[model samples]
Target: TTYDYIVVGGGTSGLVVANRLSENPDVSVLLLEAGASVFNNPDVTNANGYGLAFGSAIDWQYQSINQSYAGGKQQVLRAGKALGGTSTINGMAYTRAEDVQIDVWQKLGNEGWTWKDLLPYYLKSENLTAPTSSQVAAGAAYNPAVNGKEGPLKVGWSGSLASGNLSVALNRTFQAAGVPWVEDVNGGKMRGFNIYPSTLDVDLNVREDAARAYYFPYDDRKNLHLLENTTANRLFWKNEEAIADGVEITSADGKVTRVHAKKEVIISAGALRSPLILELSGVGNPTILKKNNITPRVDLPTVGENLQDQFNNGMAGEGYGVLAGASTVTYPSISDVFGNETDSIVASLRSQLSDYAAATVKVSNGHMKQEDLERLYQLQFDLIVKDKVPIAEILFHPGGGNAVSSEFWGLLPFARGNIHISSNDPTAPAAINPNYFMFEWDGKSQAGIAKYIRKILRSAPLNKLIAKETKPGLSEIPATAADEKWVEWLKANYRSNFHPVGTAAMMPRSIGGVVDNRLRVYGTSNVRVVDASVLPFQVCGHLVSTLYAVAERASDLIKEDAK
Candidate 1:
């Protein structure tokens, strides 16, 4: 097969780029996906019951190393292998980053990347559905002009809440804790308790997954080819590049093909597979390539490092008196999660900002520079320190009849980690060690979040609203900071939130990043990455919404290069 451009992994940013690239009538694009298309699959079509799709055939469902910081417990890292990638199965929460956080991107040495620059893209990518009166009553807010009225992807509030009063009570509790009720969290300022929207076709009440929103509409386009159930084994080379001439793929029907790209190859295989693909094609650290018995292609050492992910733990409680009739959910700030130590903890985090940046660049062998690293880290830190936006997400699930669940996590942790290929084969999963809680502040941040949860559970408005504690009750850990038993309980129960990013970060080549600002792989002439792997740091919101904008922005950038 031959095309002007080839996009791997019909997931996340892949579909967006393909759609935008195909807009030019003269351009032909080939999209190679490892999993079958979920365009018509019921598992992906429905947005209301996303968790039901978990552990299904489409989920990559990768496992993580035993987290030494969290009681030596192994965790799960779920990725989407189907057409839409993780967006197919992810909890569809459509929120964006804080404004201050975006400014940090500019500070990081990312030219023309800031809240001001990216805001227009966010608006352009979204087809906003005005909230219903019921939704407004439930606390969803947004600026009419801040969202696009016509776009491929739909963004709107859920049609119904399980219980109406739950939203009111949650807002009251957030207000009691000093967080104001927000009408919409997507206006580039995500904080406070609000009924946020999701990427969905509100009329059909279906998920607005990448494939559904982008590729499926023109699924029959003759110029557009989708090689599903086929794996890209390795990149066929051209000259000395990490550059690729084509891909060697094995079809499900046992046919082997080498497809060529005349223009460029965009690697949107996601954070996990993209870097490994780079390594298989010899575009990573020379030391790692030689260790795995492969010759270096691009000598870009930062191919698979700077790994970041979040760990989550849930709390359950029996009905104290009122039982399961009522439920409450709210997004808290750093202050709400960490309380009095918020200032001190944030100060210490700032001090390590420079060190963390320096360390990441060194690990990648200077592929990423400290200036870029610090710039990205500072943006993320601004959310935690200045805005006090909660780094992790918290969901309150009301048990069907007898209990309530408070699922909580630290939105951001100071831990910086790495992932590398353990084998030479492209199909093999890389050895991923996020160094979970390796840094001192990581443990403190999570522990502090847990501690705050404990406080909320014991406090009045919410305490009076819920049932008695079931998991980690007073019997598990007394009401004190030195509670060793409480810490131990947390260590054993923590699992990952599956928001891994930064293994193939985008920054200046002088830094530890693997890709440049335009998503082009460093030292490569015609190869680029467009996925979560390129995110320099974690965003405050769920991955897909932000990814949609990033992918859309990347598509324009790719197109601009041709001019």
Candidate 2:
């Protein structure tokens, strides 16, 4: 079958690109999704069901290798395998990234990706509904000037809020702890405590995933064809060049075919899947390809290098009534979390930049040169230490009967690992090793954040109400405990935050970046990656909001280039 464009992955970014390209009816677009449609599945549609689909048929529950730096336990990395991709199985937080982080993309040779330029696309994808009057009284205030009012994706507060005066206690408590409350965190900056919004259809009380916002509503387009439960194995090249002209796919019926792409082929597979697909096509490190017995078409050694992800840890307490809502969250800088220890931590990170880079490269078997990683970490250091980006994130969840839960993590980790295919079988699982907590700084940062949560629990309003620490209670870990003890406990208890990015980074090829600034793979002419994989650096907020904005912008870029 011949089509103007063949988009691999019917998930988030792929569906958006397909919808936009097929808008012209003149150009036919085909989307290949490895998973079945979950449009009507209650597990995906339930607004309150955050982790209902994990380990299910629709979840690609990828497992990681034992983390040596961590507790030597394999982590379960969960991603959606259905029409919406990971968006179908996320917490649905709609917080945008910090302005400086988005601007860093431009500095990395990606022009036209600054926060000022990308802000318009964010609005283009968002349709934030005004919070209900009762919700507003409960600290649901938002600025209409910057809020999106007319877009496909619904952004709003849930019907059941934490009730009146509950936010007041949490706000006053956080303010006492030096974390100010911001009216809205969506406008570039993210340092504060606030009641954030979620991606949900408030009217129908359903989770607003990528498929619902971009594909299901536009299913009437005659030019848009989606083949569900079809895996795209690799690319087919012609003209004796690296340009990808078609894709090799296998459908659920076990029928294999080579479909033609009249114009281009886009790879929107998630970060972990995209790099392995390139490797399957012999477009990765020549040495690794030889081991798998595949002829090297391109010698991009950094295809899956520079892998980055955040860790998830939590604390809890119960007393009289609920103190914080589930949507209540805080983003604190290093100075805020460490206080007097800030300078010490910052100095330690600065001194270890070169060593951190060297150790990471050594672990990669020199797939990542130490020099490039040093330069990368130098900029990363500036983001955390010099520019004062939010380095730690904390979230509050109110369970029944005063069972309040709090989750915290180091927002920006310097450790880098990779993902690659060991077997030539298209269906074989990829070797994923995030190498979490490789550096001392990562472990220290997590420990410091854990200590900061103790301060919050001991703060004025909360301390006066709470009776005892439940999870990892003071008796379990003690208030004046050392960082090693906290890190040890964290290693055993922490699960993956599932916010993986930067596998196929959009930087210059010379610096071990797989894709160019235009989101195109360096060695390919007609192949582009449009997903979290293209994000060169990690953002401070949840990846869900940034993904929608990025995909919307990718749709525009693809349209302009096709002309």
Candidate 3:
């Protein structure tokens, strides 16, 4: 079968792209999902049903290469295999990126990729429902102008903010800790404590995954077709220039076939595996291809470089009563995270900026040039030091038995790594090395955030409500411990936050980018990647929200080019 557009991996962003592209009935679209459709799966449809899919058939339990720096541990990276992809199994947080970070994309040679330019697309993909009067009293609020009233995806507070008095108490606690109350954290600037919206349908009381929001509703569209339980082996290149014309797929029954694309092939297999797919199709580093005994079509060495992800560790504290719902605080800069020492921290980071970039280039084994790395590092520094964008995120889940759990992570890390195919076989798993805590700043930031979490719990009027500390208790680690001590605890307890990105970063060719600004693969004419892989840097918010906006914009860009 031939399609006008073939979207690989019917995941969060891919569904959005396929839906939008198939809107014109004249355009035919085929979506290949390696897993079956979870249209009625209770595990996927339940609003609070995260972790229910873990280790289940829908879960792609991909393991990573051992992180020598991080306790010499190999972490499990969870990705969804069903039609909706990771969104089906994610925590359902609907947070967007910091405005300045999106603007950074434009600065990195991506024309028309500014926050202002992409803001409408963000709005375009959202169907933001305002919090109810009761929900508002419980701390759910938003700026309507920054959200969309009518769009494909649903975003709003959950069915009930049911944490008893814990919700109100945490809000008060955050306020007392000098964190302001942000009515809408998704409004370009995510800071302070507020009830975050989830990707769920409040009216129906169901998780609003990409397939449910975009594909299922339009399932009967004649022009749109979905191939379930079909894995793409590689792309069928047409000529010496490596134009992708079709995809070779293996069906659920192990029958191999090929499907042609009349227009273009879009890859949205998330960050972890998309790079490997490219490599399998002869579009990665020449060295890797040669090592695997495959001929290289394009000399794009950065295909799997610039891999970035976050590590998460949590603290458990005893509470007097049941704490329900969720609250979060986003610290945008050194000033926000560390008050008086902000100047020192900023100066220290700035001084080490060039060195960090050089180390990153070296660590990447020259896949990234020092000059390009320096420019990217400088941009990150400006955001952290000059523009004051978020550097850490502290999420407060105020319920679990009689204790409150606070999970936190450094929002942005300078550590660079890679994910490459270890074999020529398409079925072989890619060697993923996030290189967590490889840099001094990465470890320091994680440790600092842990200390800050303890500070918040120990400070303010909420301290009186606490019963006792549980994990990493005061007995395990003393109060007023140094950063080094905290780092020791983090090294043992941390796990992958499951937010891997930038394996196929979007930037200029000179900067070791795999894809150009428009998400077009640099050496390929008719192929593009529209997933977390193309995110040049990690954002303050969750990946799904930004990805929806990005794929929406990419759909428009593709339509515009077709004209």
Candidate 4:
């Protein structure tokens, strides 16, 4: 039987797209998931069980190629393999993109796609539970005007409330640090310190995953079908046309079958796998296609290019402090990141944009022309200098001996990489390289945040609770040590923030975009990528929230086009 829509991957974005498309009783939707059902998996449902599923059956712990820049070792990239996708394995932080951050999409040629345009979809999927009085005292605050009151995804503060004293103390501390307090971090502009919400059910205290929010409640829909333990191999195109006819997949039992789609095939397989699937489907760079023995369907050379991800580093506090509940975050703007060095850093970065653009072009092997890269770089530069969006995110996690550990990363990294199919085999490990610390600004920004976090540990009433840096203490890396030491340590210790994006960016075809403004693949009429891969830039918040809204918008576009 053929379905009107065949949504591949059945993960976060895939589930949202499939569920929305199937909302119309007249249309049929089939979702293909590579992993079995995770409905009862405590590793996924327990709101506080963060790392319990790290090496479990539901994790697709993909590895990257050697990162010559990052200590010359391969990075372990974590993603969810279950029905909910990475949302099942992720930390459930419910955050959204900055206002200027989304506006840049329109500036990049994606018409009618901006913060205002996407906010509705975000609210469309969000079911925000009002903060409890106790939670409010514990610093959980939000703007009712901006948050959604009637959506499917359960988003709110959990039961575990950080001490009201600790909350107020940190608030005062951030205020003193000039980070300011935001009533709601999810409200487009994210430049301040506050208690951020998580994607969880406040009633049950369980994680609110993609399956829980989008799939389970709508399971009774007759036209919506989900096939589990099935690995999608490649797309079979119609002869003499650029349209995708159907998908060929290998099931759990080693049997292969060709499943047909009547209208369209939506690839929601995340950033890492989406481009590989495009290559496997003969829709990527022809150079790599020929090498993998797959006949080219579309000569889109930028299919797997422009891969961007953040670098994560954590530090343990020496002080005895206990502040746990409604996770705390400090979204620092560029001024906060560089402090007194702001003017100089901006001045230097402005002059370096041209060289940075040229370097990016060289890295993409000319797939991205120097002219295009230069314009993109300056636009991004303007966002950093003029727009003053958040540059680094500092998360204050309370654990490990009542210590308030700080795990943070630069929100926007200029360096880029790519992911390509290593072999034609669907299960074959693709060559993934994030190119961490490749450029001068990359390491400089990282080191700047590292140094800034140190300053935070030493500042104000908050410092009254601390003793010293325990992780890389002054003994390990002295405070007087040059920035080189912080940069070196970062190279040796940084891990993938696991926020890969932009492999099939939504931009004009001439500018190295794999997908058009409407998310349809270039040179192909019926195929589209509706996952994190289509995000042209890395957002300040976690990728899941943005991905949900993006898939929702893509679903609307597909429905409109279907008409």
Candidate 2 residue-wise lDDT, 468-487, digit = tens: 77989988898777789998
**Model 2 segments more than 4 A misplaced:** 162-166, 239-241, 321-326
lDDT by residue for model 1 (1-563), tens: 88999998999789988988898878899999999877777878887667777888998877667676667766678888898888888877777877776676666667878888887777777788887776665556687867888777788866764344334555566678777776667777777766667788878888888787888887777778888898887687876445579888888887778999998999998888888888888888899989998888788887888888877788876555434322233567777776777788778887888887776665556655677667667767776777776665667656555566777777677566777888887657677777676655666666776666666555556666666677777777767547355556667787777888888887676756677778888888888888899888777777887777888899899899987
- Return the TM-score for candidate 1, rounded to 2 decimals: 0.92
What TM-score quantifies how close candidate 4 is to the native fold? Answer: 0.98
Q: How far is candidate 1 from the true structure (C-alpha RMSD, Å)?
A: 2.7
Q: TM-score of model 2 relative to the true fold? A: 0.97
lDDT of 4 by residue, 1-563 (tens): 58998999989999999999998999999998899778899898999888899978898889999998779999989999999899999988988989888999999999999999999999888999998888887888999877888777889988887554345666787799788999987889899998999999999889999999999999999999999899899888988448998989898889999999999999998899989989999998898999999999889999999999999998877656554444689898899889899999888888888888888887778999999998888878888889998888888866655577788898888889999999998889999989998877778888898888888778788677777778777887898899889889999889999999999999999888889989999988899999999999989998888899998899899999999
Could you tell me every candidate's TM-score relative to the true structure?
0.92, 0.97, 0.98, 0.98
lDDT of 3 at 412: 82
**Candidate 4 segments exceeding 4 Å error:** 321-326
Candidate 1: count of backbone clashes, pairs at least 3 residues apart or interchain = 15
Better of 1 and 2 by TM-score: 2
Off by over 4 Å in 1: 240-242, 320-329, 347-383, 481-486
Alpha-carbon deviation at 171 in model 1, angstroms? 1.1
Against the unseen true structure, what C-alpha lDDT does each candidate score?
A: 0.76, 0.85, 0.87, 0.88
TM-score of predicted model 3? 0.98
Q: Write the per-residue lDDT of candidate 3 for residues 156-269, one digit (tens) a residue.
A: 888676445666677787777677788888888887777788999889999999998999899999999999889998888886567898999999788889999999999998
